Design a protein around this ligand. Sequence first.
Ligand SMILES: Nc1ccn([C@@H]2O[C@H](COP(=O)(O)O)[C@@H](O)[C@H]2O)c(=O)n1
Length: 388
Amino acid sequence: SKTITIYLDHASLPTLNQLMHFTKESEDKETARIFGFSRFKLPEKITEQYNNIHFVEIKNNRPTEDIFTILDQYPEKLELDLHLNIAHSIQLFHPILQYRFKHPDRISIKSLNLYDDGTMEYVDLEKEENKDIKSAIKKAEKQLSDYLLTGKINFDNPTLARYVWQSQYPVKYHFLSTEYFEKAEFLQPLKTYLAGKYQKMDWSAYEKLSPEQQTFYLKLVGFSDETKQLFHTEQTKFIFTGTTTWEGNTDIREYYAKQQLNLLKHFTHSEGDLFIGDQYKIYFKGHPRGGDINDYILKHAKDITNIPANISFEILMMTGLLPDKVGGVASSLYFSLPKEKISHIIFTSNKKIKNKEDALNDPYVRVMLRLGMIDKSQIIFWDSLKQL
Ligand SMILES: Nc1ccn([C@@H]2O[C@H](COP(=O)(O)O)[C@@H](O)[C@H]2O)c(=O)n1
């Protein structure tokens, strides 16, 4: 066989993981890789050292037909190691299935590594609390069997269907929060079904890396020495973390930036509802896909060290550069933080939240209550805050 290692992700959290996986094999310059992001994302000094590396576009949660053209170039017998995100695993797989119908004996699936895309996985599970989890698993297994036979997507329970890949392939899951699966009683049947099949997105597997692997990785993910110097001062440190939306609308986008800067004001200003104290030096960490929203913040923010948006927050924990305090809008990044470092986590919603009972029905709120990253007495959505 020839092995082909296919990384289908471009979102920050799964791609951060996948880039470390790749790092562990980086000396092998020969093996074929496919990445689901731009050829320009990574340093060309690094990528041009690789002989069988290609980059493919993901559109509407599927790789484009370029992946067919890329795999057509390998006439040998092929084993595919797929790395894909849990939330969209079904859609991302659709074209791989299509291609296998054309090349069944030459094209086999050696393994799946399935990583959380973010917190969507967790807010979708919240909606499943009163359902019969045991039978949903069985139903999903059969429907995945049909998917593999027909190539057609039909799942009664798309959320739970994400977790039944083991009934067809060798699979290993990497979870943002293993605890959610132990602490959520309704998920006991799922926890049992998946026993042995999962690990946590640890980030302590960065320690395991060679000192040289470490240096390579940091160049992949874009952490330089400048960025390291940003934290030289012995002064104590607060990082404001930003967010984004997946919406092309001006006003939805401006709304965001406006709310967010305002929110920053409330942590930093002594007139603020969340004022942290004058001891802290302030840093900004924009959302990787926040674009203009990050810009607006940097246009208006006095007295603030930017940590370039494209650097995933979790690198700070790997490298030991984590601050004393962190605050901002709810994000996957908080799931990595020791609790004493949290200043405040703020929520958003399309629904106007008028009271505590509205608040409690928010599924992100529920996730964080379930994991005890917040308690009930302090729930804040950012519209309820005032302009400063
Ligand atoms: N302010 C932010 C927000 C997200 N992120 C990155 O994006 C990932 C997903 O965050 P969201 O759940 O906020 O989309 C995080 O795990 C992190 O790697 C960041 O580096 N800085």
